Design a protein around this motif. Structure first.
Motif, PDB file in Angstrom:
ATOM      1  N   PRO A   1       1.450  -1.436  -0.024  1.00 55.64           N
ATOM      2  CA  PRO A   1      -0.059   0.175  -0.157  1.00 55.64           C
ATOM      3  C   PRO A   1       0.743   1.225   0.066  1.00 55.64           C
ATOM      4  O   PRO A   1       0.502   2.563  -0.325  1.00 55.64           O
ATOM      5  N   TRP A   2       1.941   1.859   0.553  1.00 51.54           N
ATOM      6  CA  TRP A   2       2.489   2.517   1.100  1.00 51.54           C
ATOM      7  C   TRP A   2       3.258   2.809  -0.527  1.00 51.54           C
ATOM      8  O   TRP A   2       4.140   1.812  -0.756  1.00 51.54           O
ATOM      9  N   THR A   3       3.306   3.995  -0.838  1.00 50.82           N
ATOM     10  CA  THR A   3       3.826   4.583  -2.157  1.00 50.82           C
ATOM     11  C   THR A   3       4.091   5.642  -1.766  1.00 50.82           C
ATOM     12  O   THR A   3       5.932   5.956  -2.802  1.00 50.82           O
ATOM     13  N   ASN A   4       3.743   6.447  -1.645  1.00 49.09           N
ATOM     14  CA  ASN A   4       4.388   8.033  -0.802  1.00 49.09           C
ATOM     15  C   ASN A   4       4.827   8.461   0.273  1.00 49.09           C
ATOM     16  O   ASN A   4       4.035   8.247   1.425  1.00 49.09           O
ATOM     17  N   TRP A   5       6.061   8.968   0.436  1.00 49.02           N
ATOM     18  CA  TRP A   5       6.552   9.430   2.080  1.00 49.02           C
ATOM     19  C   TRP A   5       6.715   8.542   2.670  1.00 49.02           C
ATOM     20  O   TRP A   5       7.555   8.694   4.323  1.00 49.02           O
ATOM     21  N   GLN A   6       6.739   7.216   1.940  1.00 48.17           N
ATOM     22  CA  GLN A   6       6.936   6.281   3.105  1.00 48.17           C
ATOM     23  C   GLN A   6       8.561   5.719   1.978  1.00 48.17           C
ATOM     24  O   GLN A   6      10.016   4.909   2.176  1.00 48.17           O
ATOM     25  N   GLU A   7       7.466   5.237   0.530  1.00 52.05           N
ATOM     26  CA  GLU A   7       8.344   4.387   0.143  1.00 52.05           C
ATOM     27  C   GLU A   7       9.013   5.718  -1.249  1.00 52.05           C
ATOM     28  O   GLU A   7      10.165   5.556  -1.999  1.00 52.05           O
ATOM     29  N   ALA A   8       8.239   6.668  -1.589  1.00 46.95           N
ATOM     30  CA  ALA A   8       9.243   7.975  -2.573  1.00 46.95           C
ATOM     31  C   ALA A   8       8.395   8.888  -1.318  1.00 46.95           C
ATOM     32  O   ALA A   8       8.199   9.070  -1.368  1.00 46.95           O
ATOM     33  N   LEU A   9       8.605  10.210  -2.767  1.00 47.07           N
ATOM     34  CA  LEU A   9       8.236  11.500  -2.900  1.00 47.07           C
ATOM     35  C   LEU A   9       7.237  12.175  -3.407  1.00 47.07           C
ATOM     36  O   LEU A   9       7.184  11.950  -4.775  1.00 47.07           O
ATOM     37  N   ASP A  10       6.490  12.134  -2.829  1.00 45.68           N
ATOM     38  CA  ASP A  10       5.497  13.265  -3.651  1.00 45.68           C
ATOM     39  C   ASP A  10       5.542  14.628  -4.199  1.00 45.68           C
ATOM     40  O   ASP A  10       5.393  15.132  -5.632  1.00 45.68           O
ATOM     41  N   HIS A  11       6.809  15.162  -3.710  1.00 44.97           N
ATOM     42  CA  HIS A  11       7.198  16.266  -4.611  1.00 44.97           C
ATOM     43  C   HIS A  11       7.984  16.287  -5.260  1.00 44.97           C
ATOM     44  O   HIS A  11       7.861  17.174  -6.233  1.00 44.97           O
ATOM     45  N   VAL A  12       8.821  15.094  -5.972  1.00 41.40           N
ATOM     46  CA  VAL A  12       8.757  14.459  -6.683  1.00 41.40           C
ATOM     47  C   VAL A  12       8.463  14.547  -8.237  1.00 41.40           C
ATOM     48  O   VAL A  12       8.889  14.554  -9.096  1.00 41.40           O
ATOM     49  N   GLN A  13       6.951  13.893  -7.528  1.00 40.68           N
ATOM     50  CA  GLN A  13       5.623  13.787  -8.126  1.00 40.68           C
ATOM     51  C   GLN A  13       5.496  15.205  -9.183  1.00 40.68           C
ATOM     52  O   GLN A  13       4.830  15.263 -10.490  1.00 40.68           O
ATOM     53  N   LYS A  14       5.631  16.215  -8.784  1.00 37.58           N
ATOM     54  CA  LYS A  14       5.420  17.566  -9.279  1.00 37.58           C
ATOM     55  C   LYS A  14       5.836  18.265 -10.447  1.00 37.58           C
ATOM     56  O   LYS A  14       6.883  18.926 -10.006  1.00 37.58           O
ATOM     57  N   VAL A  15       5.561  17.433 -11.577  1.00 35.38           N
ATOM     58  CA  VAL A  15       5.810  18.426 -12.601  1.00 35.38           C
ATOM     59  C   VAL A  15       4.575  19.688 -13.028  1.00 35.38           C
ATOM     60  O   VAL A  15       3.293  19.487 -13.256  1.00 35.38           O
ATOM     61  N   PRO A  16       5.240  19.901 -14.266  1.00 34.48           N
ATOM     62  CA  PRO A  16       4.187  20.987 -14.600  1.00 34.48           C
ATOM     63  C   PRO A  16       3.565  20.478 -14.712  1.00 34.48           C
ATOM     64  O   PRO A  16       3.001  20.411 -16.165  1.00 34.48           O
ATOM     65  N   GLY A  17       2.193  21.479 -14.690  1.00 40.52           N
ATOM     66  CA  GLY A  17       0.486  20.451 -15.422  1.00 40.52           C
ATOM     67  C   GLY A  17      -0.211  19.993 -14.118  1.00 40.52           C
ATOM     68  O   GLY A  17      -1.444  20.673 -14.393  1.00 40.52           O
ATOM     69  N   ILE A  18       0.398  20.414 -12.736  1.00 43.51           N
ATOM     70  CA  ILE A  18      -0.211  19.960 -11.459  1.00 43.51           C
ATOM     71  C   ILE A  18      -0.332  20.487 -10.988  1.00 43.51           C
ATOM     72  O   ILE A  18       0.740  21.372  -9.984  1.00 43.51           O
ATOM     73  N   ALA A  19      -1.880  21.381 -10.827  1.00 42.34           N
ATOM     74  CA  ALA A  19      -1.955  22.096  -9.299  1.00 42.34           C
ATOM     75  C   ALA A  19      -1.109  21.614  -7.870  1.00 42.34           C
ATOM     76  O   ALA A  19      -0.801  22.215  -7.230  1.00 42.34           O
ATOM     77  N   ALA A  20      -2.194  20.738  -7.807  1.00 44.16           N
ATOM     78  CA  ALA A  20      -1.606  20.237  -6.604  1.00 44.16           C
ATOM     79  C   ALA A  20      -1.715  18.266  -6.486  1.00 44.16           C
ATOM     80  O   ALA A  20      -2.018  17.669  -7.322  1.00 44.16           O
ATOM     81  N   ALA A  21      -1.053  18.055  -4.996  1.00 46.36           N
ATOM     82  CA  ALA A  21      -1.427  16.502  -4.413  1.00 46.36           C
ATOM     83  C   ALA A  21      -2.249  16.520  -2.997  1.00 46.36           C
ATOM     84  O   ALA A  21      -1.132  17.357  -2.449  1.00 46.36           O
TER      85      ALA A  21
END
Ligand SMILES: *C[C@H](COC(=O)CCCCCCCCCCCCCCC)OC(=O)CCCCCCCCCCCC
Lengths: 403, 218, 393, 218
Positions: free
Chosen positions: A69-89
């Protein structure tokens, strides 16, 4: 040129069936353009309500991993995911638990979200007079319930909830049902079919039930664009895990936009056919009028004016008739359009049968807005068809003088 | 010093069943010389006006205009000649119902002019010339048929006239004003030369003027 | 030539050398009615085909009007199937259904179960994959899930899942003792329809033990219908002894009422088209009487009554409506018929994918008859005014 | 005896001039002989022909038929009275230019008994009796102008025409063979016919009937 044509119309007040030759064409154009205007206004209202009632509360896209179940903040970072096009997550917990309360029950897909993250992410207010969202924290572990679900369970603002919760275990201890009842925090109204599935719990408190730690599932997107979703949702690799296929806002609710556009085209074509039939009516009255006033067309030929003017005279005659019809129709359409919801409610009360079923439809009421460019398009197409109809009598207006 | 004669004749389109009109036509209108024809047009003579003036194409023979045969030109060119020079009254009944008489008389000038402002002024001065200032701005159907021809002639001569193919100038009004139109028509001759060719069948004024011809079958 | 005065109207239809037959003014009403009927029949048939596609999808794989006794489950000995031949059904087979909830190791879901006997054939049979239902013998507590249901629950094959029946017990002072028995999955059925996710197959005896019904009695008999959409008519029928007639109108039904309202809305728009055509009809006759008001004077004194001439203009408009209605219906049905087979591929524009069509002859005939009535009733006003007095002979 | 005329007049708006035709007249139709009434025209005399027929309700007037009034019957009752017994031609070329000349002649024959063998047979010879056998199938539009009227004359005559009230046998004539229609009505009277009320606006070469009257504008 305008004098002859205009006085030809207003002149024929005695004889010629005034109440059966012109008012009928006026009524034809009126119903045509009026119903087309009402339909386009209803479609624009549907677009507005879909934008402000589905697009503002449904996640714009999803990210999922077939692994743990763990994807972000334990195994990866959602901050890396933020790329031009996404307002927030913000990470979301997909937690299906289902609810049964004996004689009352329905199916819900419980979802775990941090209140600040959802408040900043998408416009999903509590939508109730209670306004208990500010109290909806990771405190007393309150649960949000949809209106249709609360109606099914016959529950209200404050009481316990017969929520059923499953358990997970890596093939060691299975089928051990458990139940926890904490509280209910208001309702979550959208006046749509989404009100029968949604139920929200604080993410921090939700982690306390599903027995893990600092581990959250995917589902973290909020996109400034609302149509390019299918393309740039392909932003995997920033979290690795699985990149074969991730759900987006396309598909689940993308058919609504296709339906709205298709209804628009069908209605537009059908009412253009209506206007064409009314143009058949007006070309009939034009040919009759040119047959009646043949003597006058003869004397005008005797007095100068070449072939052009008579053609222009009768084109202006037909265009004036069509313009009067279109103006009456468009004013009726405008006055009825801005009061479309009240009149639909009125006829629903009179008929005593709800027009739109809340079970299958997402509106429960008929919206309407006016764009004032559709009106211009309506007059343009109506006048163009009227001129096209008027063209033929113009050619059959160059008759040689009988005597 | 202008022919106006080409031995033209007119027949029906088929010619095998329907009859024809008088043959070997010999107009000699020439310059602005007044004429009169009383050759019993009731038997049928208006077909020449359908030819004389370019109303309809003649089956045989043409008409010589001022300096060029108008039959050998486009209808658009022909219409310009009809508006600028020729003045018709005929018996089209000259009725524009629901159209006011003041604008009705000004219609030939209303086919395009350098300045619209003075078009109306020409209408009023012709109304006073025929004596029609009273009851000028109202429907012609409301007005009696006695003055129906009175306004009809003004429309023929409101434009600067050179050819006037007048028919039935008397109308159905009193002999005092019926004879007075000659004084009215004579006044326009004082201004400048203008032809007044009249085809009728009333013998009261057949001898009333000079240069009178007659042709019904020849 | 025909002592019915229709000679005058028929000759007006053909017209003289310089009449309106070749000027597209007498047949303009005809072509307007033709286009109106074209829209009516074509769009209504296509959308009816859409509706019928849902008939086979969500009703061709669903229980239809189970016959259950008034007290509760119906004992087969009391009311055997040998004497339940009610008119309108196709055949009969025992079945047991009820609302249940499914919880796997990971997720939870809700559905309705089918207590069917594998001995008889099942409309789901041509949709099973790598599974034959004959394994559903009593005792094994077997079950078959749906592809969407399996995906939602995660389990694929050989796993063990639990079924909880809400309508059971919940009265013991120990809080609750719901009827719960473990079942094992054997396979899935992959019908390409939305019935998945809430439909599973179980044996009848297992269903009986699940719901605490005394003895081996059954809830009711599945009643197939040849035209299930008209089931509400079949609702009023002489049911043998005490029983209910509970239908799909309670679980489904709102969706079908919505699609019927959609049908009525499309019909209203296209009827607006045909009504504008009808309004066009009256003016064409109004011109056709105001002109030829001269020739009526000739006939009026010649002897025929106003009623005699009230018909010649009545048949004048009507005959235009007659030709338009038949030509529109016949040609229109041709468009719908060729829009599935030999269909010019235009699927890129619309949703496409082999647009289903269902030309229902009863629907087409009524529309043609209504177009006849609307066209004819319109012509009354010009005909009635056609014989008023003798003005301006 | 047949028809007894009374005071007949035409009415207009009360505010304007009603323009009454007559208010003191009383004339009767003898069964077998006929009248002839023509004076100065211009006051609805041409329309007065339609007044005798069952078309418009008279203004302060009434007419009677044999043994029973004509102004006190329903429209259906009027139909039979003027179908097989009464027929009359009109002023202008009213001959329904849509059917064939055979159909125009047989038009009132078709409105009645269905003897199709007799209906077609009688019309051809009867129209030939008028003087038209060849080219009879031609449409009225493709026909001689004077020949248009003579066809209507045959149309005005039926199986048993008890009375005709037409007043324009003249008009578009030829003066060579068009004189035959004058004696055709008399020949039927000489061959046991019925009363044929007919008189032209011009008394010249038309006073040859039984008795001659004048028209008044009272
Ligand atoms: C998917 C749509 C939904 O159904 C509707 O759109 C119903 C129409 C109502 C929309 C109007 C909204 C305002 C309501 C009132 C407006 C005026 C009321 C007038 C009262 C007198 O349903 C369909 O479109 C299904 C039909 C499918 C046919 C599409 C193409 C088939 C034929 C293609 C080729 C033909 C030549």
């Amino acid at each position: 040129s305008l004098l002859i044509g205009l006085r030809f119309s207003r002149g024929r007040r005695r004889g010629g069936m005034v109440s059966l030759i012109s008012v009928i064409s006026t009524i034809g154009i009126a119903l045509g353009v009026a119903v087309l205007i009402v339909g386009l206004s209803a479609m624009n209202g549907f677009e507005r309500e879909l934008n402000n009632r589905i697009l503002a509360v449904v996640p714009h896209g999803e990210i999922e991993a077939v692994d743990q179940p763990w994807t972000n903040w334990q195994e990866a970072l959602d901050h890396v995911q933020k790329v031009p096009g996404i307002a927030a997550a913000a990470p979301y917990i997909n937690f299906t638990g289902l609810v049964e309360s004996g004689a009352n029950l329905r199916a819900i897909q419980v979802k775990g979200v941090n209140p600040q993250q959802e408040q900043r992410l998408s416009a999903l207010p509590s939508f109730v007079q209670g306004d208990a969202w500010r109290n909806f924290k990771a405190g007393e572990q309150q649960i949000i319930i949809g209106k249709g679900v609360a109606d099914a369970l016959k529950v209200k603002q404050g009481d316990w909830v017969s929520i059923m919760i499953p358990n997970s275990n890596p093939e060691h201890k299975l089928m051990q049902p458990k139940r926890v009842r904490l509280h209910v925090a208001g309702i979550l109204q959208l006046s749509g079919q989404l009100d029968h599935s949604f139920a929200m719990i604080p993410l921090a408190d939700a982690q306390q039930y599903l027995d893990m730690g600092s581990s959250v599932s995917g589902i973290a997107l909020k996109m400034t664009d609302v149509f390019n979703a299918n393309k740039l949702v392909r932003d995997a690799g920033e979290v690795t895990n699985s990149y074969v296929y991730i759900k987006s806002w396309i598909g689940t609710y993308g058919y609504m936009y296709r339906d709205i556009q298709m209804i628009r085209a069908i209605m537009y074509l059908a009412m253009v056919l209506v206007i064409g039939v009314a143009c058949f009516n007006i070309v009939s009255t034009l040919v009759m009028a040119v047959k009646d006033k043949s003597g006058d067309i003869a004397v005008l030929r005797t007095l100068g004016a070449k072939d052009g003017l008579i053609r222009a005279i009768f084109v202006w005659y037909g265009l004036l008739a069509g313009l009067f019809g279109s103006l009456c129709g468009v004013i009726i359409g405008v006055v009825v359009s801005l009061q479309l919801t009240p009149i639909i409610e009125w006829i629903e009360k009179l008929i005593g049968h709800q027009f739109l079923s809340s079970d299958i439809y997402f509106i429960d009421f008929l919206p309407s807005e006016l764009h004032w460019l559709d009106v211009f398009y309506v007059l343009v197409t109506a006048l163009l068809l009227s001129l096209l109809a008027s063209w033929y009598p113009a050619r059959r207006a160059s008759n040689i003088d009988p005597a | 010093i202008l022919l106006q004669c080409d031995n033209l004749c007119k027949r029906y389109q088929e010619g095998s069943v329907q009859t024809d009109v008088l043959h070997n036509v010999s107009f000699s209108v020439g310059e602005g010389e007044m004429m009169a024809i009383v050759g019993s047009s009731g038997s049928g003579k208006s077909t020449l006006l359908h030819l004389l003036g370019g109303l309809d194409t003649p089956t045989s023979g043409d008409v010589i205009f001022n300096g060029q045969p108008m039959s050998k030109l486009s209808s658009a060119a022909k219409a310009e000649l009809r508006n600028q020079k020729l003045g018709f009254i005929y018996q089209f009944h000259h009725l524009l119902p629901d159209f006011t008489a003041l604008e009705n008389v000004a219609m030939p000038l209303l086919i395009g002019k350098k300045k619209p402002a003075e078009i109306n002024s020409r209408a009023l001065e012709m109304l006073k010339a025929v004596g029609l200032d009273h009851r000028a701005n109202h429907r012609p159907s409301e007005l009696s048929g006695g003055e129906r021809q009175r306004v009809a002639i003004a429309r023929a001569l409101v434009n600067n006239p050179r050819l006037v193919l007048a028919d039935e100038p008397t109308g159905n009004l009193d002999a005092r004003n019926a004879d007075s139109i000659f004084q009215l028509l004579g006044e326009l001759n004082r201004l400048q030369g203008t032809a007044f060719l009249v085809v009728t069948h009333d013998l009261q004024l057949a001898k009333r003027m000079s240069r009178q011809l007659e042709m019904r079958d020849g | 030539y025909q002592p019915v005065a229709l000679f005058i109207g028929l000759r007006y239809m053909r017209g003289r050398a310089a009449d309106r037959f070749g000027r597209f003014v007498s047949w303009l009403s005809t072509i307007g009615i033709t286009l109106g009927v074209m829209a009516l029949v074509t769009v209504l048939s296509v959308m009816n085909g859409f509706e019928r596609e849902l008939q086979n999808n969500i009703l061709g794989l669903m229980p239809q009007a189970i016959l259950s006794s008034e007290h509760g489950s119906l004992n087969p000995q009391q009311l055997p199937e040998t004497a339940v031949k009610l008119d309108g059904v196709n055949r009969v087979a025992p079945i047991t259904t009820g609302d249940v909830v499914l919880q796997s190791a990971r997720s939870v879901a809700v559905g309705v179960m089918l207590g069917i006997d594998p001995a008889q054939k099942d409309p789901l049979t041509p949709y099973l994959v790598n599974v034959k239902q004959t394994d559903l013998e009593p005792g094994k507590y077997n079950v078959i899930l749906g592809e969407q249901l399996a995906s939602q629950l995660g389990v694929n094959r050989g796993d063990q899942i639990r079924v909880m029946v809400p309508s059971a017990s919940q009265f013991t002072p120990m809080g609750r003792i719901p009827s719960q028995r473990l079942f094992n999955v054997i396979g899935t059925f992959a019908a390409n329809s939305e019935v998945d996710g809430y439909e599973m197959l179980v044996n009848i005896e297992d269903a009986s033990r699940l719901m605490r019904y005394p003895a081996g009695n059954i809830t009711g008999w599945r009643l197939w219908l040849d035209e299930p959409l008209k089931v509400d008519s079949l609702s009023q029928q002489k049911l043998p002894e005490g029983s209910k007639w509970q239908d799909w109108r309670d679980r489904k039904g709102e969706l079908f009422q919505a699609v019927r309202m959609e049908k009525n809305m499309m019909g209203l728009l296209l009827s607006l088209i045909v009504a504008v055509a009808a309004f066009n009809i009256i003016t064409s006759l109004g011109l056709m009487v105001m002109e030829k008001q001269g020739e009526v004077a000739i006939l009026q004194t010649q002897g025929l009554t106003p009623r005699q001439i009230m018909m010649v203009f009545m048949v004048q408009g009507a005959s235009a409506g007659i030709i338009g209605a038949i030509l529109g219906a016949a040609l229109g049905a041709l468009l719908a018929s060729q829009l599935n087979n030999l269909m010019p591929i235009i699927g890129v524009l619309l949703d496409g994918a082999a647009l289903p069509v269902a030309i229902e002859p009863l629907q087409v005939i009524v529309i043609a008859l209504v177009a006849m009535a609307i066209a004819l009733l319109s012509t009354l006003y010009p005909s009635w005014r056609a014989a008023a007095t003798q003005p301006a002979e």
